[model samples]
Target: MNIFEMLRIDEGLRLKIYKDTEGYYTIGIGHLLTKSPSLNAAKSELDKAIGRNTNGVITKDEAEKLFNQDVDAAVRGILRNAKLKPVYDSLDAVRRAAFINMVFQMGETGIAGFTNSLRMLQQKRWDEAAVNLAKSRWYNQTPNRAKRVITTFRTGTWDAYK
Candidate 1:
């Protein structure tokens, strides 16, 4: 019903560092990497609480706060870089959300690496981009997630595809 619930349904909340679908270190609703200052601090606190052996837990509040901060920064970074400004600007809010989601999962560099997909995206060939996305290793690795993304890209619907 709420935004947080929607994200949790999609992302799956985790208190510890778990490998994501792409096999990157992630925690707190898809926050990636250990290099983040806030994440590092959270890890340190978790370590202090339960030691560094296996899994550690953070409070739900902590996780949510971190998720917001990281997600907001990533969105801002994507906007600021303007690597595919025209392509991005051409999209409606729904499509832009898909792009932002990809940027969060894969960094801007990783998203940019989908050269052919980007070309198709810029050309306004949503179906082609969806096909190109499906053909990639990322899709093979995370079929459900990729299916949802590709479906949304092609049809502009956020749900009921995968």
Candidate 2:
């Protein structure tokens, strides 16, 4: 029901470096080690986090740490956005978590671009918000996940957590 549980199920965990759907060098729970640039720098950062020269691997504890950090950053980024803050504050716990999950997946700037959808959410027009989200490229790129998030938004419930 919380963001961590939702993201853990959605993002999954990996101890080894692998390519995401977008072909980015990713590790841990959806951590992008390199986005087609700065591989060495990314590796060094990962090494520092894990407290070892992992080369291309990490421990479960290390992965969890990174996941926590990423989630914290996502939550803070969403809350720091002036436009998103009011919409976020108006929502119930489930809807708020859904919004945070969106930020977790897409970042603040990405979600902020959905002006119409955000307006719908701000107005408590759940159905319209869901429809707006469904019409996005994000829905097409990750339909199943998008459906779960959209369902959460529309119903203002935790059914998607089930």
Candidate 3:
């Protein structure tokens, strides 16, 4: 199941996400509170969680919203790699999916932080890009939370889980 599927959302909350007014949608992870059912709450949570970057305003709601946006951007960035897909494209699928997920979690800034990696990727510098990927924070921070992501990115293999 996808992350959304794994989250046991009740009909009421689900409906709220589907339809809401004057409130936040949340995943229900606390007392009189939640991980935050809505994107705004998530952004607020993120702002609080990560603190502000000169703005002092962030929200947990931005996490998923920004993630979705960044993941989409990364997918676009990767479209040039291949022209089509097939059922047996597991390796490619895993890599692309993981890359999208990682970029989503880290944002394009993080992706850009791997300038050498991106340049190498563009130059078809497989070994170099793979090596450079390890030199970025994306490599350092996500390995534990996403070992498969790290391995797949570094090796350009498909065994990683998205």
Where does candidate 2 stray beyond 4 Å? 37-42
Q: For each candidate, what is the lDDT?
A: 0.69, 0.86, 0.42
Candidate achieving the largest TM-score: 2
Instruction: Candidate 3: count the clashes.
Output: 20
Q: Please give the distance, in angstroms, between residue 144's alpha carbon in candidate 2 and its true position after superposition.
A: 0.4
TM-score of each: 0.77, 0.93, 0.42
Could you give candidate 3's per-residue lDDT for residues 38-157 as a string of tens digits?
566554554454456313232445344443444455556545434212211333544455455554345455555655555555455566666666766545654544455556556665
For candidate 1, what is the lDDT?
Answer: 0.69
Ten-residue region with minimum lDDT total, candidate 1: 1-10
RMSD of each: 4.8, 1.5, 11.7
Q: List the residue pairs that clash in candidate 1.
A: none
Clashing pairs in 2: none
Highest lDDT scorer: 2
**Could you give candidate 1's per-residue lDDT for residues 34-139 as a string of tens digits?**
5444655546655653435434566677678777876787778877876766667878776777777777777788787788887788778988898888887778
